Amino acid sequence: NFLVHSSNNFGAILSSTNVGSNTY
Amino acid sequence: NFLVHSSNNFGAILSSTNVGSNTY
Amino acid sequence: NFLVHSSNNFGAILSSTNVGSNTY
Amino acid sequence: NFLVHSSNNFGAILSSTNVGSNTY
Amino acid sequence: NFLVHSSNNFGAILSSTNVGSNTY
Amino acid sequence: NFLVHSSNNFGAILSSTNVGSNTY
Amino acid sequence: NFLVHSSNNFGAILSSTNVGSNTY
Amino acid sequence: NFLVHSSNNFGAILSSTNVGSNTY
Amino acid sequence: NFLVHSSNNFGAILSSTNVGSNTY
Amino acid sequence: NFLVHSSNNFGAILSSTNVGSNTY
Numbered sequence: 001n002f003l004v005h006s007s008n009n010f011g012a013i014l015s016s017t018n019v020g021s022n023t024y
Numbered sequence: 025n026f027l028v029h030s031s032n033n034f035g036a037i038l039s040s041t042n043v044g045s046n047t048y
Numbered sequence: 049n050f051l052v053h054s055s056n057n058f059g060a061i062l063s064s065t066n067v068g069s070n071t072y
Numbered sequence: 073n074f075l076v077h078s079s080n081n082f083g084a085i086l087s088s089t090n091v092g093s094n095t096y
Numbered sequence: 097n098f099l100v101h102s103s104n105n106f107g108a109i110l111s112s113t114n115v116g117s118n119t120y
Numbered sequence: 121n122f123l124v125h126s127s128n129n130f131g132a133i134l135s136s137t138n139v140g141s142n143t144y
Numbered sequence: 145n146f147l148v149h150s151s152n153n154f155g156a157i158l159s160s161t162n163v164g165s166n167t168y
Numbered sequence: 169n170f171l172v173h174s175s176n177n178f179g180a181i182l183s184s185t186n187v188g189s190n191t192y
Numbered sequence: 193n194f195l196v197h198s199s200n201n202f203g204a205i206l207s208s209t210n211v212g213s214n215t216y
Numbered sequence: 217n218f219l220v221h222s223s224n225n226f227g228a229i230l231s232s233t234n235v236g237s238n239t240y
Contacts, residue, residue: 011229034058035205037227059181061203083157085179107133109155154178
């Protein structure tokens, strides 16, 4: 479990339920 | 379990339920 | 289990239920 | 189980239920 | 189980139930 | 030129020159 | 030129030159 | 030129030159 | 040129030159 | 040129040159 410069996400939405859910 | 610069995702939405679900 | 610069996904939506599900 | 720069998917939606399912 | 730069899929939707299933 | 929900392509790479062209 | 919910592409790479072109 | 909810692309990389072009 | 909720792209990288181009 | 809630991109990198270009 050696992790050098890992877990990279760029410009991310992560662990998200409703994205843009509008006009109800 | 040696991970150098891994788990790369770019511009990502990850673990997401409803994307753009609109006008209900 | 040696992973150099692996698990790359670009511009991804991953683990996602409803994409664009609109106008209900 | 030696993985150099593997598991590449680009522009992907992966593990996804309904894609574009609209106008219900 | 030596995998150099394998498991490549590009522009993919993978493990997906309903693609484009619309107008119900 | 009436187009209702047309021009659908799913999981597509379109207008593309070299796909997977590797190991030169 | 009436377009209702057209031009749909999902999980797409479009207008792209070299996809995965690696190891030169 | 009436466009209701058109030009939808999901999880896309679009207008892109080199995708994943690595290890030169 | 009437556009209701158009030009939707989700999780996108768009107008992009080199994606993931690494290890030179 | 009537645009109601248009030009939606979520989690996006847009107009971008080099994404993740590392280890030179």
